[PDB]
Amino acid sequence: GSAFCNLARCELSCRSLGLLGKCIGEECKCVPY
Numbered sequence: 809g810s811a812f813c814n815l816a817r818c819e820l821s822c823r824s825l826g827l828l829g830k831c832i833g834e835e836c837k838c839v840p841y
Contacts, residue, residue: 809834
């Protein structure tokens with residue numbers, strides 16, 4: 809919509825904090841595997 813999450817880019821971003829990436833509501837949100 810006005811934003812668009814990318815799972816590959818969210819996965820590479822959540823990898824920088826030590827956890828898994830997912831998209832929720834067209835935003836990036838990280839999760840504990």
